[PDB]
């Protein structure tokens with residue numbers, strides 16, 4: 306998922322904004338209440354129909370809006386195709402209109418979904434992930450940088466595995482498999498050639514059933530695939546910890562021990578036991594590792610103020626490793642009110658009083 | 663990283679008669695895509 310353009314009117318603290326995204330790193334910088342996290346949540350909402358801070362969709366409308374209406378336009382690329390979402394949220398009338406279009410080579414647009422529910426479903430299908438997965442992995446909200454790190458084991462596995470598989474495809478495959486089985490059950494239910502034909506059907510039924518169990522029983526392939534995914538992600542995460550902490554900190558996953566277990570010079574520690582700044586540094590390393598391993602699937606990496614808990618030395622260390630990501634064909638955005646950190650990066654997007662300056 | 667590529671390896675290491683099973687899988691996948 307590669308963001309390309311975002312237009313926002315009267316959404317949260319934003320009045321009117323129109324931005325274009327670029328590969329590499331951009332730091333969104335501005336004071337408290339500027340509209341930085343409003344931009345972050347506009348993207349979340351454009352895609353999935355929900356933001357972060359409010360459960361109620363109409364609460365996202367900028368209460369200063371004369372017409373009581375928020376408008377979002379979000380353009381992004383995925384898998385060599387270009388898409389555009391338009392949403393209008395009217396808090397006065399309590400209406401929420403949404404549409405998803407493909408932008409064809411000619412530049413013309415062809416709608417492929419209308420209405421919030423269908424737009425959401427089609428975005429999930431296109432992106433291959435759900436909203437929770439998006440915000441726990443590579444699109445990290447303010448105050449929630451460490452949420453994946455301290456999550457319970459079942460949420461960790463659901464989330465990390467979601468990044469690397471398509472539920473829609475698997476859902477279709479399971480339905481097709483079951484329908485074939487049911488058809489054979491029907492046929493079987495109702496000479497050399499006939500004996501061979503009944504056995505052919507029995508064997509096919511039993512083979513479909515065997516395949517069904519290996520593929521779809523949780524304890525079989527799914528468990529193994531999740532393990533393969535975690536191994537790849539943690540291998541990279543360990544490499545970052547090694548660099549960032551001079552060999553001190555290690556990370557592993559263990560369902561029985563409560564999820565992510567950190568070792569401090571060999572001594573095991575639940576992730577939640579780490580200090581505030583340690584959790585920020587390790588969560589950023591994990592997130593960075595996920596973003597790298599997920600290239601091609603998810604081509605964005607946003608962190609909304611995951612930096613304030615870092616002391617001077619760790620902030621510098623973190624900025625240095627993050628800057629290495631500049632070489633990647635990824636849209637990378639860090640949001641901060643903190644000049645100490647924004648100064649480490651070349652390209653900036655400044656926001657103040659709900660507009661870009 | 664590829665889900666079905668990993669599955670194929672997984673199945674061959676668990677099922678002596680993995681040839682038939684993977685044949686069926688390809689047919690199913692073909693239909694899902696084509697559909």
Ligand SMILES: Nc1ncnc2c1ncn2[C@@H]1O[C@H](COP(=O)(O)OP(=O)(O)NP(=O)(O)O)[C@@H](O)[C@H]1O
Pocket residue numbers: 317318319335336337338339340341342343344364365366367368369447610641642
């Ligand atoms: N529905 C709303 N209508 C109008 N303003 C709102 C609404 N909801 C929140 N705000 C305000 O919008 C402004 C911007 O919020 P936000 O984008 O989160 O700030 P920020 O730039 O991320 N600042 P900070 O995280 O404190 O460094 C704040 O003044 C909010 O209080």
Ligand SMILES: [Mg+2]
Pocket residue numbers: 341342343447610
């Ligand atoms: Mg904020």
